[PDB]
Symmetry: C2
Subunit: 154 residues, 2 copies
């Protein structure tokens, strides 16, 4: 299954300028990074290179509008949602996570099975709006700085 | 203002592996083609390609990965929502429409200002869908019955 990890405020903002409107949240950062640590990740090309020191999962399916060969042996290039899913399927992935950024989210949201949202309580980039009546809140653990929600399709 | 125009059955289906899944409705097509007639139209490369004999507004902002040469005097290229708004800002346009396909409606949904949606009335089988939208975020500006569909104009809250 296809699932996205995202931390977003009440107005659905995920980013202002470049990154976070909000400050600290290491509770959040421990959480998501543990979550995706052993399964394939799907990410924008700039987020990939913004994490060259500490790469996000089992592998990385990198969304590029351009053909790219990578340094890392675990990095892959996908040009579409379909191609990404095929790469993860060739990896024998059980699940693959969509961690950012905004264009990638919008793009994958129609194909998403589950959503691990960190509800944070003014910006330009956004997490896509979902139908509240067509997703069941599977879990809602209260945490430090935010409140983690896993949302499944009905 | 960015505004989409789409026709979907119940299930939000907008197609089946090539074309419309529902048959007739030329009152849809007349009103949709005339709607977008003069303003710029945001659309995909394959949707543009297929529409080459007709072509929907006065200038077409073609959303594609590849940087492409287009020998059509006004049919621009875009690699993002942002670039696509810049180019319509450049053409002095008031309104920019998203004609789609499915991936493009998705990419433009968090930026939309309006949705102009024709609700074709039965359930159909498909594979390409128009995106879901939160009930709390959108207000229904108007809704009219016509033959074979009902056009809805949804403004954001």
């Amino acid at each position: 299954e296809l699932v996205s990890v995202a931390a977003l405020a009440e107005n659905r903002v995920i980013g202002r300028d470049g990154e976070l409107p909000w400050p600290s949240i290491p509770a959040d950062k421990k959480q998501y990074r543990s979550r995706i640590a052993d399964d394939p990740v799907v990410l924008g090309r700039t987020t990939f290179e913004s994490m060259r020191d500490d790469l996000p999962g089992s592998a990385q399916i990198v969304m590029s509008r351009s053909e790219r060969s990578f340094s890392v042996d675990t990095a892959h290039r996908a040009a579409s949602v379909e191609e990404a899913v095929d790469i993860a399927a060739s990896l024998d992935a059980e699940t693959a996570y969509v961690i950012g950024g905004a264009a990638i989210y919008a793009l994958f949201q129609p194909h998403l099975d589950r959503m691990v949202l960190s509800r944070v309580p003014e910006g330009d980039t956004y997490y896509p709006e979902w139908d509240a009546a067509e997703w069941e809140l599977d879990a809602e653990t209260d945490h430090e700085g935010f409140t983690l929600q896993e949302w499944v399709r009905s």
